[PDB]
Structure 1
Amino acid sequence: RICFNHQSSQPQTTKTCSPGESSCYNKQWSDFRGTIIERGCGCPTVKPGIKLSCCESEVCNN
């Protein structure tokens, strides 16, 4: 599995996930700084007030 791992609108970067990892994630939240979009490997645990979208296909978390 290969996922995008860049933040919000910075230039696109990818990451090779560790063996057996099948998902990619896209997290989104706002803080005092702005609207943040985090991307990477896996499907992390759902935490209050943060939007989480998980997908299982190559570079699916744009």
Structure 2
Amino acid sequence: RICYNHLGTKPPTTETCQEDSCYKNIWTFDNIIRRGCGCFTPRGDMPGPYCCESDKCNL
């Protein structure tokens, strides 16, 4: 659905996707935070990223 596509420091913008969820985690590759659609990959208690089930919910 419409989730946030803001990339850590990159310019923050929303992005429509298929997963009604929105994943926003600090773990990434070159940047740091990344808001997308769905949940992160290593879901668990060790990591503390942010997944959600609403549009633009990972702001």
TM-score by length of 2: 0.70
**Aligned partner (choices 39, 43, 46) of residue 39 of structure 2:** 43
RMSD: 2.7
2:7 maps to 7
Q: State whether residues 46 and 52 of structure 1, in contact with CA within 8 Å, keep that contact through their aligned partners in structure 2.
A: no
Mapped to 2, the partners of 1:56 and 1:28 lie a distance apart of 18
Overall identity of the aligned pairs, in %: 50
Matched residues in 2 for 1:41 and 1:27: separation?
Answer: 11
- How do residues 10-29 of structure 1 correspond to structure 2 at under 5 angstroms? 10-18=10-18, 21-29=19-27
- 3-state SS of paired residue (1:46): coil
Structure 1 stretches of at least 4 aligned residues deviating more than 6 Å after TM superposition:
none
Q: Distance in 1 between matches of 2:52 and 2:40?
A: 12
What is the TM-score with the length of structure 1 in the denominator? 0.67
Counterpart-to-counterpart distance in 1, 2:20 and 2:47: 22
The structure number with the bigger radius of gyration is: 1
Residues matched between the structures, number? 58
